[PDB]
Amino acid sequence: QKLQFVLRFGDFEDVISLSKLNVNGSKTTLYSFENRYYLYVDFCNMTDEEVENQLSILLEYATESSISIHRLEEYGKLIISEHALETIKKHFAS
Amino acid sequence: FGRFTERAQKVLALAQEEALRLGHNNIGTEHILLGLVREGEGIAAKALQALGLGSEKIQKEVESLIGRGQEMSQTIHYTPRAKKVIELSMDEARKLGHSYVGTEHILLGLIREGEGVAARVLNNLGVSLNKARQQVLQLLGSNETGSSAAGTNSNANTPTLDSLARDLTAIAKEDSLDPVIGRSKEIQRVIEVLSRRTKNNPVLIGEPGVGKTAIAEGLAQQIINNEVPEILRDKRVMTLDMGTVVAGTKYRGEFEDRLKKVMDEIRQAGNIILFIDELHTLIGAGGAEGAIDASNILKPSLARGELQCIGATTLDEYRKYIEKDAALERRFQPIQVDQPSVDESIQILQGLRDRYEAHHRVSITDDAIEAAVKLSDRYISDRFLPDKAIDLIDEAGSKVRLRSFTTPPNLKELEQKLDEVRKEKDAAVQSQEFEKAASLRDTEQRLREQVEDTKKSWKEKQGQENSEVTVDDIAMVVSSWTAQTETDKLLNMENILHSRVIGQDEAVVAVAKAVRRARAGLKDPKRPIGSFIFLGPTGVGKTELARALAESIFGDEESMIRIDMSEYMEKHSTSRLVGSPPGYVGYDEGGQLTEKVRRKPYSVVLLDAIEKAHPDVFNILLQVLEDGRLTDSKGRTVDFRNTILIMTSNVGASELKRNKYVGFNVQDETQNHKDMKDKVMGELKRAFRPEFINRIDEIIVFHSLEKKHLTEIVSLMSDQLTKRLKEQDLSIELTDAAKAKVAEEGVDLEYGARPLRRAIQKHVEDRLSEELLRGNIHKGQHIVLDVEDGEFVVKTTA
């Protein structure tokens, strides 16, 4: 079970919602793509169950895009990369 | 949607509890699962207990996926995931026994919409998602009343009853049938006519026009129970439908092959009843073509009583059976049709008013329903008296719910803000503007929860509207076509007609009141909203008033036909010794006039100079005046109980062109008046028939622009001039001094308010244009046409 997912979050406020109690040792990278904000979440060294666990919470605030990470890697657009949730809690909540 | 069963709502609310109880902001899919199983013996709930998944077993999994610890429960409405499970289940309950959606569908729908946290719980608890969906499914059974079959009956009936087609009895033994409301009198007349032998076939004539099949539900019911003669027992009832036969085939030959075969299987005779809708098409009799001549087989089928049948036919159709014999004149037999009378009409409406609770804006008011009907007969005015009605009911049955989306509480303003935020926010999120998006976001989401809270404060527009149709509302919708937007039209009619015609104000108030009489109801509903003859100089206010009526009543300036009868004269010009004849009355009756007025069914029909037409034209008009119908082209009755017939005239012309004229004194008005209102009204009658005038409501006499009619018509035309150039950015004005000089062209006894156009053209268009081109006046700057010496002088003003 993949420990890294490419997720779509709707309105920006959703990214924030997720952020304010999730980061979880897991670098997470935030795109704006199709104007809605995608987050490519990377659970770093979390077990499959642990990842589904963590990821549940995330998907309380969003859904998990089918979209492959490499579409993003080429033609994407960043909002905060690699520390996406963490930064958003500061600057987007508050 | 369409309102739901408890079981759904119940599993759902249990989700919201698990949200806060486990600490979740948005009540996730993990809670929906807990919700299902906590509803115990819900089909969903029950299913999970089979799967081995208890509330416990699920929850053990659940707390390990989200669980903790958003006990704050920020914006506790669902996850969109969970909302999807609900949308899916609803339709999957439409699919699987439940219009009103319950539990079964929710687990079933859950599996279908099997995602996130929910999904993972069952596949972790050793249960395949479809094993769960199975489980819900296998706890289904029959719920269609009158059905749950396990019995057996009858034999010989088999080959026949299959084919083809609808069976009114079946749906009435599954009883989904709505009676509805009679249309009673056909139904007795069938059973005498249908327990016969030699001829055995009823034939229902006319009124199509009630929804004939409603009468059929009558028939169904009485042929079963219980006053019926002996051959009308051991009967089985088949409806024959043209549609099933034609479907899947192209060529005519295939339809006939099947039809010969069907009539043969119809051998269940003396035990079978056949209902033949649109009987004429098959019989094909007379005319130039009565359609597919199945008749050859069908006529003996009807005659034999094998295809002992009930014929659903119309006014003209009867001809095409009684013309054939002796198996269409040994088949046909007429019976007297009725509908649910004008008061009854209202009642049908009311019965299904309440059933637009899938529309929730009416359910009631009764008085408004009553209005729907009563107002419709004169306010367009060409259909059956309940159908008209329901369009009003239902229109108005949104119209006040439309008044929601502005002021009444207008907590629409909240939403108005919330949007604007998102924008600011959004664009800020795109630029970043991080914390500069943040506060906008916050302003947004502030708005959002507040919105969602006031969106179920906008249950108040349901508590506002699902009484009330509004009488006034309903009236407004009839007027939209044709209280609210009709009584301002009624009450101020003279004023409104006056605002477009100043050409004879005398005339305006008279016309106003006559239209208003009929349109307020007290005229036979078999006569136009106005018959008139308009005497006068021509175009005095005459044409213009026809226009002004269209303008006042319909909210469209023109919804007004206009034919000159002097072209269909046949009064001083038809034909000569060996010279060819014309067709004139044939042209008006035979198609032209009638077709045109049929297009806008309500329309001010303006028949110019009808006194130059012979007495024969008037007879046709007389049919409008009597019938409120005109009978024309391909056997149509075009209901002229709608229309405002306005006929212009002048045949006592001299007196009408020596008409009222205050500019020649007040005492020149009432003795030109008194003179024209008798010699004209008798040259009018001499150019009509007194019989014509006897069903024409009023003869209005118009008088050339007395002193006093003119400069205000001119100041509208001259102003209409000044207004059509302003849109494209050019300011012209004719002063009152210049509007006066323009008005002078028609002061003529002979002319009406028709020459006025020429004088606006001459004094405004032409006068300005030769000055705009030379640069005495220009674009956007104000161009004053004034009189300063008894002649125009164009001055310029900023």
Next chain:
Amino acid sequence: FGRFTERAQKVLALAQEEALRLGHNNIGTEHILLGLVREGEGIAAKALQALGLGSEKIQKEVESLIGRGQEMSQTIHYTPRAKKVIELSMDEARKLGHSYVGTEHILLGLIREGEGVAARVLNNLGVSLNKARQQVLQLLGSNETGSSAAGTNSNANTPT
């Protein structure tokens, strides 16, 4: 045409740089190849790095084909081959929706334009021309503008 994405133009101008850098009168396909891989992580560029074709690896081959020494760089516009790679790319961008045409399409267009000096570089550097065209393609997914699949509702709605 219909106006282009940067990524196209960006891979392209680096060819012109390469024109003078090895001396090419009209800037051959070998310079276009270098252009792609020196544009780094554009889809064309990125692709080549996957197959193992770095700018270095390429350039080693490249200088040994033409390379030297038309440093005069006579007229410095493209070679007709190199112009073709662009004509092709426009269509390889029709192919991978982009009215404004960018990088993938250019490597894809290159493969199409396999005549080139560029093409010969990759088949010498142990990379099939289609192994590269593949490579450009597989760094895409779907751009879309509102769709992204997964998750639906409603059932009864189907037949109508």
